[PDB]
Design a protein around this ligand. Structure first.
Ligand SMILES: O=c1ccn([C@@H]2O[C@H](COP(=O)(O)OP(=O)(O)O)[C@@H](O)[C@H]2O)c(=O)[nH]1
Ligand SMILES: [Mg+2]
Length: 306
């Protein structure tokens, strides 16, 4: 009744079990918690979910077709009983303080809370986040409209007042930045009151692999093209609610062009170039307004590695 956790999962049965165990080690009264696991028509997860059910009130929904992370999260939102919903992607983990650290804010009058994010480069558990290898963390306060510029967190970091009660859902046409579109839909479409909670963190696993052993393929260009396209899509859909954020939006195509040129020249970008761009854009939104040529230079240093 108090909290529903929504875990969409697709051919990751091993990682799903790590995510579910991180729910089992929540410091929380399990009487007030329901877990909804949504299999997006991948390989079965009944055994994983059966195991977690020994300690949790878990429900498995089997999608009859692969609909995407948007479709699968909606499947969970439609059936969620909790006053508040907490998203968890099957390859991230909660810290034990995930709900004890956010629920006071939601009950006190927030509708939307996001916590710090540790971008973990090695696989960790819910009780072992501090053991993660971490080069960058997403800990941006909510005082400059960075969210109006571009996405600076991920669903696993979000606890929010029931989107079904608001009639607010994920857009199934978006396969990338669907979460950004959704957060803007709550914040601007439904006037959710957003609050940052820096005392709580999750682990979001971004394990490097082969790409930095090879070079930019024409698929890094294809994927960025779709990212760029959806970014323009959502920008048109949700106008910035401040003129400063509206001006800083114009830096993202500058950054995209820099990225394309690098890819085309066969030169890889920093593995965290997006997150280093967040830091540049967060500065461009505040304090004294830097010049546009200074910011264009910082984007350069951000995409290089420095
Ligand atoms: O067709 C898909 C692809 C992914 N997912 C789920 O959506 C979440 C986010 O997917 P992923 O981790 O690949 O997203 P990213 O971290 O790249 O945003 C995970 O729980 C996936 O299992 C899904 O339900 N259907
Ligand atoms: Mg993921």
């Amino acid at each position: 009744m108090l909290v529903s956790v929504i875990i969409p999962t697709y051919n990751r049965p091993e990682r799903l079990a790590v995510a579910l165990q991180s729910v089992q080690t929540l410091d929380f009264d399990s009487e007030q918690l329901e877990v909804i696991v949504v299999n997006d028509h991948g390989t079965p997860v009944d055994d994983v979910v059966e195991a977690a059910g020994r300690s949790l009130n878990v429900r498995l929904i089997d999608q009859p077709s692969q609909s995407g992370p948007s479709g699968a999260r909606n499947a969970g939102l439609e059936v969620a009983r909790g006053e508040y919903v907490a998203f968890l992607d099957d390859d991230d983990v909660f810290s034990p303080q995930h709900l004890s650290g956010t629920l006071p804010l939601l009950k006190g009058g927030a509708d939307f809370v996001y916590v710090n994010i540790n971008i973990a480069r090695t696989r960790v558990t819910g009780t072992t986040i501090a053991d993660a290898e971490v080069l960058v963390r997403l800990e941006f306060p909510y005082d400059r409209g960075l969210l109006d510029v571009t996405n600076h967190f991920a669903p696993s970091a979000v606890v929010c007042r029931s989107p079904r009660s608001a009639g607010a859902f994920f857009d199934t046409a978006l396969g990338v930045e669907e979460d950004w579109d959704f957060f803007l839909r709550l914040a601007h479409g439904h006037k959710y009151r957003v609050v940052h909670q820096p005392e709580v963190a999750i682990a979001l696993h971004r394990i490097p692999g082969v790409e930095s052993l090879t070079t930019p393929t024409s698929d890094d260009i294809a994927a960025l093209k779709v990212y760029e396209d959806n970014w323009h899509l959502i920008c048109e859909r949700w106008p910035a609610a401040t003129e400063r954020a509206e001006q800083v939006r114009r830096f993202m195509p500058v950054m995209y062009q820099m990225a394309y040129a690098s890819f085309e020249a066969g030169v890889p970008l920093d593995h965290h170039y997006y997150e280093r761009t967040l830091q540049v854009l967060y500065r461009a939104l505040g304090d004294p307004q830097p010049s546009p040529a200074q910011v264009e230079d910082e984007l350069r240093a951000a995409l290089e590695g420095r």
